[PDB]
Amino acid sequence: RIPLQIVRAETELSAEEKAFLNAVEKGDYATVKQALQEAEIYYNVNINCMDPLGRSALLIAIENENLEIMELLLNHSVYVGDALLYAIRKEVVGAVELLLSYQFSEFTPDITPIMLAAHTNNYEIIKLLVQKRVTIPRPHQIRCNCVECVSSSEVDSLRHSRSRLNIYKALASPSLIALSSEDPILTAFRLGWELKELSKVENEFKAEYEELSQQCKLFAKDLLDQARSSRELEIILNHRDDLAKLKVAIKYHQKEFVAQPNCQQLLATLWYDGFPGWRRKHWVVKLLTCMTIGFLFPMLSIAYLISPRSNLGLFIKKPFIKFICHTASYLTFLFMLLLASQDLHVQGPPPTVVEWMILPWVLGFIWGEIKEMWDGGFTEYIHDWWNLMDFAMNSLYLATISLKIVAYVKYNGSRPREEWEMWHPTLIAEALFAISNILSSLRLISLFTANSHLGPLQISLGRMLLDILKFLFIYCLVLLAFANGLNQLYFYYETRAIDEPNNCKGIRCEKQNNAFSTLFETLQSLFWSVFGLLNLYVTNVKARHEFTEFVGATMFGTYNVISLVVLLNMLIAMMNNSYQLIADHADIEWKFARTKLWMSYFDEGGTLPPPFNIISLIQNQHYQEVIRNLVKRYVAAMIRNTEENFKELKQDISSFRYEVLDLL
Amino acid sequence: SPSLIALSSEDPILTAFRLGWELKELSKVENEFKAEYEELSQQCKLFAKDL
Amino acid sequence: RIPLQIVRAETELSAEEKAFLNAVEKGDYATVKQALQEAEIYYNVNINCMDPLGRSALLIAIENENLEIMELLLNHSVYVGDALLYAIRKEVVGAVELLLSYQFSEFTPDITPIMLAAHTNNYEIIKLLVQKRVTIPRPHQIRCNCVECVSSSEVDSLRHSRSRLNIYKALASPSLIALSSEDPILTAFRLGWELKELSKVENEFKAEYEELSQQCKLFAKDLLDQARSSRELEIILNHRDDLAKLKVAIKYHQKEFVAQPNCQQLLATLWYDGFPGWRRKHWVVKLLTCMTIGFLFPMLSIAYLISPRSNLGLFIKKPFIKFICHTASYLTFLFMLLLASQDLHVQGPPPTVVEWMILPWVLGFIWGEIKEMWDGGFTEYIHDWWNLMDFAMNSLYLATISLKIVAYVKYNGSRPREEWEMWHPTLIAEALFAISNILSSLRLISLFTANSHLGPLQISLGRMLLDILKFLFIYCLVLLAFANGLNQLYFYYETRAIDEPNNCKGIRCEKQNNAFSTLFETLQSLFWSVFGLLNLYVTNVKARHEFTEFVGATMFGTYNVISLVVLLNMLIAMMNNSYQLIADHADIEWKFARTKLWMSYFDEGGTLPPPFNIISLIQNQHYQEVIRNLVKRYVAAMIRNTEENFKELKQDISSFRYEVLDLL
Ligand SMILES: CC(C)CCC[C@@H](C)[C@H]1CC[C@H]2[C@@H]3CC=C4C[C@@H](OC(=O)CCC(=O)O)CC[C@]4(C)[C@H]3CC[C@]12C
Ligand SMILES: CC(C)CCC[C@@H](C)[C@H]1CC[C@H]2[C@@H]3CC=C4C[C@@H](OC(=O)CCC(=O)O)CC[C@]4(C)[C@H]3CC[C@]12C
Ligand SMILES: [Ca+2]
C-alpha cells in the first residue's frame, strides 16, 4: 500500500472563502456584492484569497469575461498585481481597458504589458498600449561584447536568454510592426535577417528564432499580397531610402516576398521587353523565335557596337534578348571547343585556326570576370558560388595559354610523342585544356534556372548535393581506413614493372597488378572497386601465403560490404529523405533563383557577350500612402481570417439566470 | 461556382466540362496564377462528378 | 455580359407563406399557432408549402429539434410523408417517438425506417424500431442466378446494386448486430467474410464493401475487447455450435480478432505448457533451455514411442517442446544434407552412410505430407501455400531415389565421369538432389514466424513479393521482345563449337561467343546482362559488318537502359511504396501467422518429428450470458466514445426568448 498525502502543503480556504469563490465562479453578482459589503464590516472573508489552482477572485472574474464582477471587485480595492498580464493574455479588450483605467505568477519577471500584448499579436490591445507611450528595451548586438552583456550572461544565462527571446518575440509581432514602424517592409526584412543570424548563433534556441524569422517573412509577403493595383506594386518595389526594394529583398534572401505572383508578373513583363505577347504563343513559335535571335547574336552585338541608338542597336539591351545572345555565344564557344578535338608530333606547335578563334572567347571571359569583380565588389562576387567554377575555368585556360607559349618558345624540333618526357609542357597544356573543356561544358547547368521544367530540378539537385557532401566524409574515412590496412598488409609483395607481363604496373593495365602496393595505388584500387572495375585476382601474391591472401581478400570484402551495401544504400535513403523536404519549397526556391538570373540581365554592364565585350520627397510620401493602405487591408484581412468559449457561454448563461431569479 | 451552374445554365454538365477545360487552359497560360485556376477546374470536375 | 436567370423555375411562395416559414424557423410558437388557426378559417396559407431549399414546415421543425412546434404541426394534420426518415437521419429520439406515435426526397425509394436507422448506427432509434416487428429483406446469393435476380439486374442495374448495398449496410450495423442476433461474434465473422466476397465480385462498389467488412471485423474485435476476466474469454473462444470459435475466426481470416492482446495472452499461456515462467527469463537462460531441449529431441521421441504416460513420454506433447523437437529434427536433417556433399567414378553407386541416414527423413517427410492431406483434407492442405514447396521437395527426392535405383540396377562398371553420357541417370539424380537440398534449406523461412524480430519482417517480404510478381511480367515481356530482336539480327553469324577457341560454344565459356545465335541462348545472355556477367564483345561478328554490329550493340544498350535503369528503379519504387502500406499492419499480420503456427502444434497428430513418425446445453447458456454482458459493455463504451449543434442552440435560445416576451 502506497500512502498518498500532500507533500507540499498550502493554506486551505475557510468555508466562507470557498463559498465566496464559488459565487464568483458562478457569476452571481448579488451574492458576491453582499459578501464584499459584509467583509467590509465583519472582516470574515479575505477578498484576496487564492483557490486550489492559484487564482484569486479577480483572476476568476477575468477568466470568465465577467466585466460586471470585475468592476465590482475593482471598486472594492482588491489586489491587482499582474492582473493586467492575465487580462492581456486572455485577449479581452474590455478587461484591459478597465485595468488601464484602474507571489506565484504565470509570467516571467521580464514580461511587460506591451511585450505580452505583442506576444499575443492582438491588434486592439497592442494599439491600446501603444496609445500610451510604451517602450521595449533595445536588444544589443548579436555578437556584442560590452560589460553589461557579459555580466548578465555570467550572472544568469537563463534569465538573459529568456529576456532576449521575449524581446525578439515582441518586436517580431506583425501587429507591432504594422504600428510604430516607419517602413514595415524594410523592418520585416531586417528583423527576419537578424532573427536568422540569432538562430545561427543561438544553437539551443534555434527553432524559436527560425519560426520568428519565418513569421516576419510571411508578414512581409502578406503585406505585399494586399496590393490591389500595379501602380501600388511598382511604388513598393521601386522605393529607395529601379526595383530598389526588390533588390533589398533579394539581399535579405526574402524568397517568399520575391516569389510573389504579382512581383513575378511585373518581373516577367520587364523580362520580355521586346515581345509583348510572349505569354500567349505556341511552342514552335517560341522555339523558332529563340533560334532566330540566337543565330543573329553577332549582328546584334555589332549593331550595338556601331550605333546603340537604332532598331538593332538597343534591341540587345532587352533582358530576354540579352540572355538569348549570351546563351548563343556560349553555345558557339562550346561548338568550337568540340571542333578543337577534331601534325601532332610537333613539340610546342603554334595555335591552329580553332584555337585562334577560341582565344577571343577566353580573353572575353577573363575580362568579364574581372569587370564583374571590379563593378559589383568582392562579397557579391563570392556570394554567387558559380564564380568559383568560372575562376577555375579562367585559371586553367590561362595556364593552358602559358604552357603553350612556353612549349612554343622552348621547342622547335618535331619529335614523336612516344619518346616525349612525362612532364612535357605540351602534355600538361593538353590535359589542362581538356579539364577546362569539361568545366566549360559543365558550366551550362546554371542555365537550367531559366527553364520552367529544369529549374526546380536543378534546385533539388543543389539541395541534395549537401547530403552527398555529408556522406562523402564518412565514405572517405572508411576508404582511408581500409586503404591503410590493405597497404600495410600488401606492401611487402610489391613487384617491379619489368617483372610484370607487359612492363605495366598498376590497376590500369590489362592484367591488374600491385593494386595495394602503395597508399596512392591502394586508394585508387579501393575507389575503382566501388564501380567493380577492380578484378578479384589483385588480392593475390606470387608466394604461397594463403593466409595473407585470404586476410587481404576478406579486408577487400569487408570494404565492399561497408561501402557498396551499407554506405551506398544509406546515401540513397539520405537523398530520398532530403528530396521530400524540398518538394514543397522547390517552386519558391526556383522562382527566387530565376528572379536573380533575370535581375542579372537588367544592368547596362555586360551587355555584349564574349568576345564582343573586349572590342524627390514625393517618392517617400507616395510610398507611405501605399503602405498605410496596405497596413489597413492587412489588419482587416488578418482579423477576418476550445473550452474557454464554452466557459464564457456558461458564465453568461449563469449570470443571466441569477439576475433573472433576483429580479423575479 | 457550383451553385451558379446549378442555376442559370441550360446544361450544367456540358457547362462544367467546358468551364473545367477553359480553366485548365488558363492555368497553362497564366503561369503565376496557376494553382487557383487548377483548383477551380478541379472544383468544376468534382461538381460534374457529383451531379 | 452573361445574363443570369432561373433556367429551372419553381413555384415561389407568397408573402404570408414566407412569413409563416420564417416564424417556424425562428421557433416562435405563438405566431405559428396563430397562423395555423387562421389557415383553418381563411385558407390563406398553405401549411404544406416548401421553401427555396425544399423543406416544409415539418422538416424545418425536425431539423431544429423543436418538439413543441413539431407536435403543434402534427396536431394540425400536416403532410407527413418521409418525415420519419428525416427524423431518423437527424438522430433525434423524441422526433422518432412522436412520428411512431403519430415529391422530391433525399432518400432513395428502397430506404426503409429500420434500414435507415441501421445505417445511422444509433442504438436508441434502432431499438425503438426493433421493438416493433420490423424486417429487412434477405439478400440473395453472391452468385445467385434465379429469375428474380437476373430480371432486376436487366431491368435496372443501378437500382438493384443500390438496394443490395443499402441492405448490406443495414445488416453490417454494429448496433443491429448487438440486437436481433443469436451470436453476434459468429454473425460478425460471417458478415465480414460475405462482404469481402462481395467486394471481390463487385468491382465498381469495392471500397464500400471493403469498409463494411472492416467495420464488422472491428465490431467483433471490440466485442472481444469488452471481456473483463479469463473465464469469460475462454468461454467465448471455446464455444462450439478446444478453441473452436478461435479456429472459426482463423478460418474467416479475422486478423484483428485473433491478434487481441487477451487472446494472444491465452494462446501464449497454452503455448508454454511446460514452462510457467518463460515470460520472465533472461536471454541466455532461454537460449540454453532451447539448446538443451533440441539436443534431447531423439530421447523425447523415443520416450513418447515407448511410454506416452511418463515424465518424458507426454513431455513432447507440449506445444513449445513439440516445436523445438521438430525444429531440431529439421536442423539435424540439414546438417546431414551438408555432410552429404563432403569413389565418384562408379556408374550407379550404392547409397553411402549419409544417404542411408537421410532416407528415413525423406520417408518421414513424405508420410507426414500424405498424412496431413488425409487428415486435414484438400482445401486446408492447398491453403497453406507452403505445402507447394513441400510437394516439390518430396517429388524431387522421390525422383532422386528412382534415378538412383535405376542407375544402380542398370550399371555395374566403373567408367570415369568424363566420358559419361550427358543424360546419364546419375547426373540427373545428382542435379535433382542438389535442387532438393536448395529447397530444403530454403524451407527454413517458415520458422521466422515463431520469432518476434523475424516475423513481421517475413510478413513484409511475403507482401513485397507481389509487387515483384507484378514487375516480373513487364520485365519478361521486354526481355522476350529484345531477345527476339537480337536473335533475328544475329542468328545468321552462328558458328560451330569446333571453330571456337576451346571447342566451347555459349556465354559460359572463358571467351563468350554465340550469345545471340539462338532464342534460348539470347534469353540467357540478356538475363545475365542484368548482372553484368555478359561481356560487350559478344555483340561482334567475324565479318566486317560494322552496321550490323552497331545495330546489335544499340539493341543491347537499349535493353540495358530499359531493364537496369528504368525497370529496376521502377521496381525499387514499387517495393518502397508497398512496404509503407504494410508497416502499420505488420504486427497484426505477424500475430495472425504466429497464431496459426502455434495452433498447428496443438493437435495430437504429427507429434513425432521425422524420422520417428514412420516407426451439453450449459455451454450455450454460459456463452449467451457472457455475450449479453459483452453487448451491454460494448453499447455503453460506444455511447461514451458542426453547424447543427449551434443551430439547435440558437433555436432553443430563440424559442425561450419568444416565450419570455409573450409571457411578459
Ligand atoms: C542535352 C545534350 C544534347 C547537350 C545539349 C547542350 C545544349 C544544346 C543544351 C543544354 C542545356 C540547354 C539549355 C537549357 C535551358 C535553357 C533555357 C531556355 O529558356 C526558356 O526556358 C524560355 C523561357 C525564358 O527563358 O524566358 C532557353 C534554352 C536553354 C538555354 C537551353 C538551350 C539548349 C541547351 C544549352
Ligand atoms: C543464419 C545462417 C548461419 C544459417 C543458420 C541456419 C539455422 C541454424 C537458423 C536459421 C533460422 C533460425 C531459426 C529462426 C527462428 C527460430 C524461432 C525461435 O523461436 C523463438 O523466437 C523463441 C520464442 C518462441 O518460439 O516461443 C527458435 C529458433 C529458431 C528456430 C531459429 C533457429 C536457428 C535457425 C534455424
Ligand atoms: Ca560569373
Ligand SMILES: [Ca+2]
Ligand atoms: Ca507442410
Ligand SMILES: [Zn+2]
Ligand atoms: Zn551589450
Ligand SMILES: [Zn+2]
Ligand atoms: Zn436470386
